[PDB]
Ligand binder design. Structure first.
Ligand SMILES: O=C(O)CNC(=O)C(=O)O
Ligand SMILES: [Mg+2]
Ligand code: NI
Ligand SMILES: [Zn+2]
Length: 331
């Protein structure tokens, strides 16, 4: 069995290996990459996503989200308070202001210590989930707006043609902006490219151990757990590495820098934070190996998780018994 300790693997494809996206994901899995739940891909030195980032300031962040925490430093939830629209140039100036900027620090480990000690006492503003792409249309390799769609994969594997579309999303971050513990919708893969700016630190639980994280989360968030049998789908709960280690939950950590891709694998729980002003692009995708995960994925039916148009067909075809209850949650 390849990668039996479920370590995060780092790949350095050549320009020739970077041509065929599906084939390289399958290669990474042949080496056991998926057992970690997360892998890093460093593009070949010849590759670029676009020529420059000098002309992005007029992108609009229509609904910036202020991430307000409740709880204790290692075990907290966050809610998202909607703020007035601002441009990327306005948001970058805000991120760099004395109120929001990254503090002085020694290295990534010192900054991680400061994040976990102090996150709850601040409310950073995240420009998340913005439909769009920063890949140049002429970038032919690993262009997140030109991937094979999940609807086409389902059709290729299972023969059923379905409605829906699959497009990327931009994330503009600042110091302490936070992504809560989650797997993807329908336990899909994700791919995330850090286009510019400061790093993003990730935490991940191997898919084979995801139920250990879920049982801890039910213990730590007991009211939320009574409210919903899949409340991590709400994407609001945070648990620190120290707390994970105290409770024996297997996990790994890695820091992504500008110019690097991360891939999350089906049912790989992940969480993390941004180091300072940055911009990432991410999209979900599927492979043949995903189908069995999609069929078994938990679902939120309490009404909180509210998701995209295209998840309807995935539930309807892969989980017909759950469809009626899930759809009631959506309506
Ligand atoms: O970058 C973020 O805030 C969150 N991204 C992801 O969870 C992902 O790419 O799957
Ligand atoms: Mg612009
Ligand atoms: Ni994710
Ligand atoms: Zn729910």
């Amino acid at each position: 069995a390849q990668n039996p300790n479920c370590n995060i693997m780092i790949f350095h494809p050549t320009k020739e290996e970077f041509n065929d996206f599906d084939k390289y994901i399958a290669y990474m899995e042949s080496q056991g990459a998926h057992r970690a739940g997360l892998a890093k891909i460093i593009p070949p030195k010849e590759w670029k996503a676009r020529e420059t980032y000098d002309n992005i300031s007029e992108i609009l962040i229509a609904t910036p989200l202020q991430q307000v925490a409740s709880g204790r430093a290692g075990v907290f939830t966050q809610y998202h308070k909607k703020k007035k629209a601002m441009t990327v140039g306005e948001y970058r100036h805000l991120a760099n202001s004395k109120k929001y900027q990254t503090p002085p620090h020694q290295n990534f480990e010192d900054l991680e210590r400061k994040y976990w000690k102090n996150r709850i006492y601040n409310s950073p503003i995240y420009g998340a989930d913005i439909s769009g792409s920063l890949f140049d249309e002429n970038t032919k390799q690993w262009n997140l707006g030109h991937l094979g769609t999940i609807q086409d994969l389902l059709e290729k594997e299972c023969g059923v043609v379905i409605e829906g579309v699959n497009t990327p999303y931009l994330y503009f971050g600042m110091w302490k902006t936070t992504f809560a513990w989650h797997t993807e919708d329908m336990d899909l893969y994700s791919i995330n490219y850090l286009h510019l700016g400061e790093p993003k630190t990730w935490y991940v639980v191997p898919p084979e151990h995801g139920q250990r994280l879920e049982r801890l989360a039910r213990e730590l968030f007991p009211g939320s757990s009574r409210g919903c049998g899949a409340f991590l789908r709400h994407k609001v709960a945070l648990i620190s590495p120290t707390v994970l280690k105290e409770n024996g939950i297997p996990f790994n950590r890695i820091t992504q820098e500008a110019g690097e891709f991360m891939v999350t694998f089906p049912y790989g729980y992940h969480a993390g934070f941004n180091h300072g002003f940055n911009c990432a692009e991410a999209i979900n995708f599927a492979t043949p190996r995903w189908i069995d995960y999609g069929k078994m994925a938990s679902q939120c039916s309490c009404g909180e998780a509210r998701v995209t148009f295209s998840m309807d067909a995935f539930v309807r075809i892969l989980q017909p018994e759950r469809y009626d209850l899930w759809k009631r949650g959506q309506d």
